[PDB]
């Protein structure tokens, strides 16, 4: 309350504001650093949020508005405002990184945070200094750290944009803010805002599929961003959204490039062509009224063809497409509401049908051709993710149980696996780590019984794939095989499509009573 009044005052002070501009910032930074000291020797992460909102964001916004005076050129404009920016930015960066260094200097976070985190932050190295994973204060410390990493990320993104001459950005231009954001996501994956800011980076490089995916992750994490759905909608649902208009331009560029079959083109088709398909289900009106509207069947056929023919070098993007799509079904429900009409039930059903069409295509043309592949985790990881999703939602389970194509596909896969009770393990796999706090799979992939992990040592490292007991790629593949056979058998137990275990063959066959 009284704290809120103080930061509003910082904002108003800076709005009124060569040298005295830096002076004002220094004074405000000095007070904030002092609040943070009093907080750390529940206020901490709140102090940092009010800092971003009332002090830093309004500054960065002004540089944006001004930069956009340049592009609509102003050479004398670019370097001049880039000069005053470089007077201010090191202070902003210091406010957040000081807090990190402060935090890591007082307390041991190894009970809550991966051990190599200090290393990654170039932070150098008592019994009571070790924070227990359940105290309120321990949570406040980690959240404070996450905020520092988050706002360093945003600041870095803003700088890169100003430091750029054109609105053309190569892939690795945002490498530095992406690293900070990656670390922020790692230590508290529940926070949607980290994914949101990552997606904003990808909008600059025009990786709109990566952007959509990050926007979906930001809307569906256990603590989602409020800007998650607005940005998703700006990209896929708003005829007048700047992101949407850009998407259409990208689809233009791809249209004229479809004849080329360089990997880079196959990859971009898989990143982009799923977008209009998802768009048309969630935002049907928007995707009936544009220049690409009559190309919807084309997008799907080419997407599916690229997946069948070109999955080997592009499997990582196919994996992303799967999660985006699963997430998009819940985007659909949040955006279009609880189904009520006969028509709204059928629209929702049509989307689910398309989703399972994608599943069976993945299973039939990709995973079935790669279930022995011990080198790439993605093949069997995709099967785990489908099953974990399906077991998480009654409506989805019922659709899946009654889907003949999907049940047939799982029978074929399960039978191949059988030809190769509940499994356990000592650490998280790649796909586990990626989907931590993802809502549609209920925040953790629950096909394994990770019950005992909590009683094991080095738990934070275990939950980011690091342990003394790391298995070979082969062993990890074997572990996925077991959990898939187990989940698939549980799923098939009550399927409604006539599939049953032939107890002589010990394989699944199709049956009927007559």
């Amino acid at each position: 309350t009284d704290l809120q009044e103080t930061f509003s005052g910082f904002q108003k002070q800076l709005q009124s504001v060569d040298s005295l501009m830096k002076g004002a910032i220094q004074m405000i930074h000095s007070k904030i650093m002092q609040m943070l000291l009093q907080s750390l020797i529940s206020d901490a992460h709140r102090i940092l949020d009010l800092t971003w909102k009332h002090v830093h964001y309004p500054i960065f916004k002004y540089f944006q508005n001004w930069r956009n005076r340049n592009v609509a050129p102003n050479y004398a404009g670019h370097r001049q405002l880039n000069s005053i920016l470089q007077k201010i930015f090191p202070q902003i960066h210091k406010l957040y990184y000081s807090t990190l260094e402060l935090i890591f200097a007082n307390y041991n976070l190894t009970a809550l945070i991966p051990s190599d985190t200090r290393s990654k932050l170039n932070i150098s190295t008592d019994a009571s200094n070790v924070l227990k994973p359940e105290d309120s204060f321990s949570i406040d410390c980690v959240m404070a750290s996450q905020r520092c990493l988050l706002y360093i990320g945003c600041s870095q993104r803003y700088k890169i944009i100003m430091e750029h001459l054109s609105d053309r950005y190569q892939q690795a231009d945002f490498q530095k803010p992406l690293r900070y954001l990656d670390i922020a996501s790692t230590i508290v994956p529940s926070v949607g805002e980290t994914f949101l800011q990552r997606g904003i980076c990808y909008t600059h490089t025009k990786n709109f599929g990566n952007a959509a995916y990050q926007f979906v992750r930001s809307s569906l994490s256990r603590l989602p961003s409020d800007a998650g759905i607005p940005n998703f909608t700006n990209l896929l649902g708003d005829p007048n959204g700047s992101l949407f208009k850009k998407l259409l331009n990208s689809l233009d560029d791809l249209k004229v490039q479809e004849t080329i079959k360089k990997r880079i083109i196959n990859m971009e088709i898989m990143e982009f062509y799923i977008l209009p398909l998802i768009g048309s289900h969630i935002f049907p009106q928007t995707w009936k009224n544009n220049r690409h509207s009559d190309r919807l069947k084309h997008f799907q056929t080419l997407l599916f063809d690229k997946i069948e023919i070109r999955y080997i070098k592009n499997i990582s993007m196919i994996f992303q497409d799967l999660i985006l799509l699963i997430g998009s079904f819940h985007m659909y429900q949040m955006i279009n509401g609880v189904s009520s009409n006969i028509r709204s039930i059928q629209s929702e059903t049509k989307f689910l049908e398309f989703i399972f069409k994608f599943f069976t295509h993945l299973i039939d043309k990709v995973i079935m051709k790669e279930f022995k592949n011990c080198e790439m985790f993605q093949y069997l990881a995709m099967a785990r993710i489908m099953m974990c999703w399906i077991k998480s939602h009654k409506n989805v389970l019922k659709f899946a149980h009654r889907s003949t194509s999907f049940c047939q596909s799982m029978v074929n896969l399960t039978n191949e696996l059988l030809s190769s009770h509940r499994p356990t393990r000592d650490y998280f796999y790649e796909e586990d780590i990626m989907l931590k706090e993802f809502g549609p799979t209920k925040f953790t992939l629950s096909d394994f019984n990770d019950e005992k992990l909590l009683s094991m040592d080095n738990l934070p490292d275990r939950l980011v794939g690091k342990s003394k007991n790391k298995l070979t790629a082969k062993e990890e593949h074997s572990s996925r095989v077991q959990v898939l056979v187990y989940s698939n058998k549980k799923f098939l137990e009550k399927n409604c499509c006539g599939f049953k275990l032939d107890t002589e063959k010990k394989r699944y066959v199709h049956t009927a009573v007559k």
Binding site: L112, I139, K391, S392, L397, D450, L453, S487, E493, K494
Partner: peptide, 17 residues
């Protein structure tokens, strides 16, 4: 009431709950 950190501690294919 709500802990933002990842907690490993808390259906398996039954249509009936």
């Amino acid at each position: 009431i709500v802990n933002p950190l990842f907690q490993l501690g808390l259906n398996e294919f039954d249509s009936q709950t």
